[PDB]
Amino acid sequence: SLSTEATAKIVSEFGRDANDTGSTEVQVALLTAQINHLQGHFAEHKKDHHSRRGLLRMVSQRRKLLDYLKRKDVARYTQLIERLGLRR
RNA sequence: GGGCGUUAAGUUGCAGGGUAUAGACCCGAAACCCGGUGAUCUAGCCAUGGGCAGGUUGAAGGUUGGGUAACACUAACUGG
Numbered sequence: 001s002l003s004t005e006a007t008a009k010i011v012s013e014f015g016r017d018a019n020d021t022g023s024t025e026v027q028v029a030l031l032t033a034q035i036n037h038l039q040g041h042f043a044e045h046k047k048d049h050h051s052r053r054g055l056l057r058m059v060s061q062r063r064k065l066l067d068y069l070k071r072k073d074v075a076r077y078t079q080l081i082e083r084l085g086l087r088r
Numbered sequence: 089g090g091g092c093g094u095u096a097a098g099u100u101g102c103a104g105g106g107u108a109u110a111g112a113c114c115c116g117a118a119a120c121c122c123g124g125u126g127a128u129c130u131a132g133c134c135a136u137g138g139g140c141a142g143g144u145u146g147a148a149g150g151u152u153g154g155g156u157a158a159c160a161c162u163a164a165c166u167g168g
């Protein structure tokens with residue numbers, strides 16, 4: 001999965017600090033990063049269905065976090081998806 | 089005894105009757121063989137040139153939008 005240096009880095013970018021490791025914004029950024037990396041993986045390994053079910057979980061899971069955030073603080077939500085360049 | 093012979097003059101011209109070989113009384117095939125002449129018609133090919141008013145249909149491809157985690161997909165447009 002994501003590297004410990006690349007994980008720690010995002011938590012810095014989207015968290016209240018280094019240890020704000022479970023905030024919604026952070027969780028959704030980390031999922032985003034791993035989804036986009038894996039875009040590369042399945043480009044070459046289309047037949048890796050098992051791994052894909054794991055990717056699909058990261059997606060459905062990010063979707064639930066984004067909805068919760070939207071419900072609880074739409075302003076925090078808009079920033080977060082624009083910043084992550086999502087929704088189109 | 090029997091067969092063929094012995095006891096009939098022939099031959100050379102000339103005219104004629106027939107026959108033979110020859111086109112052989114005249115005309116007439118379809119064809120077979122040999123050597124030439126023809127692709128200015130037409131068949132196919134080769135080189136080099138020319139021609140197809142006007143009106144339709146609107147493939148692939150491309151752009152944008154929506155869409156998808158990403159592809160799929162989908163609309164309009166463009167394209168010809």
Ligand SMILES: [Mg+2]
Pocket residue numbers: none
């Ligand atoms: Mg492992």
Ligand SMILES: [Mg+2]
Pocket residue numbers: none
């Ligand atoms: Mg005599």
